[model samples]
Target: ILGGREAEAHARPYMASVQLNGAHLCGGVLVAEQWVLSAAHCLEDAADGKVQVLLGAHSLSQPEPSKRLYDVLRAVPHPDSQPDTIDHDLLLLQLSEKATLGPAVRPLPWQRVDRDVAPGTLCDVAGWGIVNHAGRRPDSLQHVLLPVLDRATCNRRTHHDGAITERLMCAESNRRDSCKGDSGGPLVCGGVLEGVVTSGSAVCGNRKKPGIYTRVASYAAWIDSVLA
Candidate 1:
């Protein structure tokens, strides 16, 4: 896991706080001015009402109240997503209105479907999750650096009965890695989003067994469908 300070620097630009019941629940990314991408589980108990997506935010401890909070016009989960297994555990949230782009806030470029990243490539992961296993979620953003793992090795680690299929990719760190509260944050490389941090067997960094993520490259077609 990257140090708390380093993670914050990398996460602040793209990080979004998903607020429910006036409390921050999870993290998301700004994929478009009118849409945000996050995990489907984040909206489990959500109702048809206003939900806030706070962008350009660094510290949640002292959020800038003046920053506009967009209402959630709609929340869409992948058709194949299974509540029991979390397969295709992705969601697209449409904002009630469009946002004006600026330096600290902008959309992330989706990776091409044909583009495939090889193992061992360095990538960055960031979020606002709990700093440690038993620790409370940090008010400040955090991030870590990790290297991509070969598909075979990742499948072995997850051992979810072949759940880590070709559609999924994985990453790990010798030191820094992703953990709780990081779900749905981007795994960025070469200025493009390559994956989304999904889950880890444990908390914080765990040497060779760090964390796993969903391959965004594999979902380029689905993303295009949503955008269209």
Candidate 2:
């Protein structure tokens, strides 16, 4: 989390904590009973191993009601995705069994149409990760609302010039944003899933450099195929 506050209890039912080898690796969104959407980079180490998905759990440290877990059967990264590159940075995780969804855990609706929102569009991001660029990781989930900035302006603000491509979207708050460990979390706009957390500046939450995400609209067809 870039600049986030402890999320309210049961605030985000679609939120999922992805673990690789019993450690929290990244955040994910429950898109269906058996499908989870996340960042491609999060699957880099789980190729031949088990990845656990924890749902309906806000804080990772203590016991909580409605907590559930699932095993990942396989990870399907975008064909064009390259771990070293940001282009096509997305992933779909297939659960070993269908997840049980209710008030505590559910699916976030995918933003299938062209999400052509203007700059300053209000959006929300959720995760369970470091509180800042160099702070201790938080056990509980965190969230913050941010405003969208178009690719061109955001590209200039990114660590690498021209890094924010058309396939990605940018969002930031002058004081709050997303960072490492928050990758693969949802970027929701208007109650619709719009993007996945990809990357940000080394010193996150900085107004100068905004975070980037894989645009969901760019992979609607591909996502549909996988679901089909």
Candidate 3:
């Protein structure tokens, strides 16, 4: 999370560290006992045995009593996902075993209704992504508060029309935004999973350019089908 503050310990129980070859590659949100939501691009180079999810962890450098790591049994990227442009950038990971739910680890409830998050609505995103332009990552999880932006405004700032689609949303603060390594993380609004971290400018946290995200609510049916 760029230009964000350290998240409260265990505050985000559903947050997961999507690891590739035992290294953190992206952020994820546990949506069921054994299902995690992430970005398809994050798994572009991943395989079942090479992927893992670390849950109930606050700091990556030290052992946490609540932490439970699970290997990924399968990874299913959205069939229509476009890796080049990152359209429909979603992925569902089935854990090798069910997660043990408790205060420190649980599934995040998602928005079941397909609707647009009104512009100006406040939301939060959390991750252990790069904190600065120098590409420094945090030991502890970090979170930032952002406000949803109108599609027109997002398009204008991004310098392209048709870039902001119905399946996508944009949010940002003056100096806070999701950066590299934050992809696939959750965007929480009213304690519900509403968005998945996707893409942002090379210079993260740019005041003019908001970060783009995959609108989770729009994929409710697909998610349900995958978990069925």
Candidate 4:
């Protein structure tokens, strides 16, 4: 998270580090005992067994007793997911074994409503991504609070020849925003997963080009069917 502070220890138990060969690649959210949610873009060229999910970890560099690593048994990207487009940008990772729920590991509930989140609603995004344009990543998780941007206003600032469809949501802070390695992280609104971090400007936090996320609420039925 760029321009953000270190997150509290175990504050986000549902947070998962989607890693490739033990290196952090993207952020993910534990949605069920054996399922992890993340951005489909993160799965590009990734192998199932080679991809691992690390949970209950706050600091990647330090030895955390609570941390658990699980091999990815399967990677299921949305059928509509495609390259060069953000529509249906989601991936569901099935763990080799069910996660053991504990103090430092748990699953998060995602938004189920079909309606878009209210504009101006306060929300938080957490990740262990680069902190700035210099490309520095923190050992610990970082987070920042931001407010949801209305589609009309967000579209005007971020249109850039593209539209902010109903499948997407936008949020921005003065200087704080998600950066590289933050993709697939959760945007928690009132303790529920509402968005999945997608992309932003060439630089980190551009007020005009705030972070864009895949609207989780819009994929409720799809998610349900997958879990079924």
Candidate 5:
């Protein structure tokens, strides 16, 4: 499910498209009616009027009644995230108002994967990013299923060696991965959120380098505290 090309508008209801100046810059997940989960790096410039959140859309360019836009009331990156490291590279976004839930806007199940997760666990990612690494931008949403890789295999001779930390996890196969404009997206396992898209290389899908994600389960307590 990760490597092949799949396009469905409302297939992933929890998916979010983070827009900046009406352009798609990142992906996110609707955790609550007003809370969205994404990578902290994506919101580094989410100032007063620089960013907004889009939901319930299949195409990024074409306007549709199925989609809704929400202003970013605030963006809170994890305090532990660092410039020298990406272990805690996670961000929580608060929308100006609750999104109108419907067929295309719903929350995914929440599940956190701990350190030392088993490899080859099947999962999937959906976003508005490009299907081909160097290809033209995708007009509609794209998705793929991939397997989770443990730290040992992920760091197999520089698959982000020293980059996969306690607060991180990874997944990749062939040339399938979260590429440019796919950051801050959710990585779902068994219909539950397991990680957040953090970073990857320009040459995505490289066997030597897998995609990096902030371990969402590690911050289950954090999210719980915030939702309280």
Candidate 6:
């Protein structure tokens, strides 16, 4: 199955298809020349430390035959991430070697530090998640466009206590969308890379129920300090 082709055009090339062996989980994103971002839950099995990053992959089934592979040299989870809650579901990976910068493989700018997009703005999300949560993961990248929700409205959805923090941004499918396995993907708005897919209620495509994301723009300072 395929997602919005035009949106995939912007996400596929730079996205990192990550794989882990043993108890390690899956999902990740390439955020810099030497850094890969992913969900901390994916790192829960780091006790044994087996993780790899693949770049230049167009689809998981037919990963570009020539794609380069890198062993993770370092894995850093957010200082506040708790193993139990999955609250700060973020991590950073340093590749064993720097990737050659070029088209089809590059860093997406993190826009959370100094700027925030207006609510109701349009954003695009791309991932290889199951077209339907109960189904198997798709072999090709899939995508959809959504609109940003204001914090007040987002809080209302969760009755003001769910984990939609200032560190996160909220959006919902315009027509009930997003599915399982879309974690760690990019959410872009106005050409600026804004957030990373985080979580939504377990169900996919429920009207009024939207997906929540880590505000990449809000984490720019923390990320820049670490990456710089």
Q: Per-residue lDDT for 1-228 in model 1, tens only? A: 234443433234666777776667667888888888887766665556456787777776685533457778778877787666545777788888887676667888867666557888888777777765565677767776677877677566334345577777767645566666677677888778888767542346665464667777777788778878
State TM-scores per candidate: 0.86, 0.93, 0.96, 0.95, 0.91, 0.84
Runs of candidate 4 exceeding 4 Å displacement: 46-49, 157-162
Rank order by lDDT, top first? 3, 4, 2, 5, 1, 6
Candidate 6: stretches off by over 4 Å: 1-11, 22-27, 45-49, 63-66, 157-162, 174-176, 200-202
Q: Which lDDT tens digits does candidate 2 get at residues 1-228?
A: 866789997779999898887888888999888999998888864455668889888888789888888888878899898878888988898888888888888898987776565788989999876786566788889999988887778767344478777778888757788877889899998898998998543467777777787889889999889988
Give RMSD to native, each candidate.
Answer: 2.7, 1.7, 1.5, 1.5, 2.2, 3.1
Residue-pair clashes per candidate:
5, 0, 0, 0, 5, 4
Please give, for residues 76-178, the per-residue lDDT of candidate 5 as tens digits: 8888776555667788889999889898889887874354446898888877766665545677888888888877678766666666777778887566787
Tens digits of lDDT, candidate 6, 1-228: 123432344345667766665211344567788998876655665556578876775566554544677888888877877767636777788899888776667876667555557898988777666665456566656667788888677777343345577777777654445555666667778766777776543476654566777777666776777788
Window of ten residues with lowest summed lDDT in model 4: 154-163
Whole-model alpha-carbon lDDT for candidate 6: 0.66
Q: What's the C-alpha lDDT at position 196 in model 5?
A: 83
The residue-by-residue lDDT of candidate 3 on 181-214, one tens digit each, is 9999999998999999885534787777678899
The lDDT for every candidate, in the order shown, is 0.69, 0.83, 0.88, 0.88, 0.78, 0.66
What's the TM for model 3?
Answer: 0.96
User: What's the C-alpha lDDT at position 3 in model 3?
Assistant: 74
- Superposition-based RMSD of candidate 6 using all C-alpha atoms, in angstroms: 3.1
Whole-structure CA lDDT of model 2: 0.83
Q: Once model 1 is optimally superposed onto the true structure by TM-score, how far is the C-alpha of residue 167 displaced, in angstroms?
A: 0.8
Better of 4 and 6 by TM-score: 4
Rank order (by TM-score, best first) = 3, 4, 2, 5, 1, 6
